[PDB]
Design a protein around this ligand. Structure first.
Ligand SMILES: Nc1nc2c(ncn2[C@@H]2O[C@H](COP(=O)(O)OP(=O)(O)NP(=O)(O)O)[C@@H](O)[C@H]2O)c(=O)[nH]1
Ligand SMILES: [Mg+2]
Length: 166
């Protein structure tokens, strides 16, 4: 069956693992548990296609950068995650995107911009500005909460659908 290699990237603590675990295991992880690199494989039916989600969950820490180039090379699609209560993580997005283009030798890689932690009232990043950034890149913007599961499948499946269209 078709395997879709999805890579989850973004700054430390934005919820890359929480999103992935909510998708695979239907539980919200509220623990402190930094990632080095973890992979998940799940058989799913998306729009009637049977396929295998191979999800590469990456570290937000600069120390794991080289490890970064490796996985970025193999990915077909990228979830670029920031947290809506963390303006620095939103600024960092640009830098993850540019490294993705660099390692993929491509201006146009399947990608979704994900604003996570949308359950929180303490927003510092307006939806408007994330939407603008995503338009500027030519990719969808999806808001998610790993905590409430709002948007979680939407983010992953939308990325699959981007890959299908590339
Ligand atoms: N309220 C809320 N908290 C969240 C959400 N997603 C993650 N968190 C919380 O944020 C913290 C960090 O999440 P985690 O998934 O470990 O983040 P990460 O991006 O994978 N960290 P790293 O780069 O170290 O691996 C955890 O305490 C987690 O429960 C969310 O959608 N809403
Ligand atoms: Mg993690």
């Amino acid at each position: 069956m078709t395997e879709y290699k999805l890579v989850v990237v973004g700054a430390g603590g934005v919820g890359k693992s929480a999103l992935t675990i909510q998708l695979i295991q239907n539980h919200f992880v509220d623990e402190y548990d930094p990632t080095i690199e973890d992979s998940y494989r799940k058989q799913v039916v998306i729009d009637g296609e049977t396929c295998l989600l191979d999800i590469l969950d990456t570290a937000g820490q600069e120390e794991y950068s080289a490890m970064r180039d490796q996985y970025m090379r193999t990915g077909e699609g990228f979830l670029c995650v920031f947290a809506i209560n963390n303006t620095k993580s939103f600024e960092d997005i640009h830098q993850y995107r540019e490294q993705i283009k660099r390692v993929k030798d491509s201006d146009d890689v399947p990608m979704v911009l994900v604003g996570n932690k949308c359950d929180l009232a303490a927003r510092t990043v307006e939806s408007r500005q994330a939407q603008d950034l995503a338009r500027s890149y030519g990719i969808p913007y999806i808001e998610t909460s790993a905590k409430t599961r709002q948007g979680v499948e939407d983010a992953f499946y939308t990325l699959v659908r981007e890959i299908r269209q590339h």
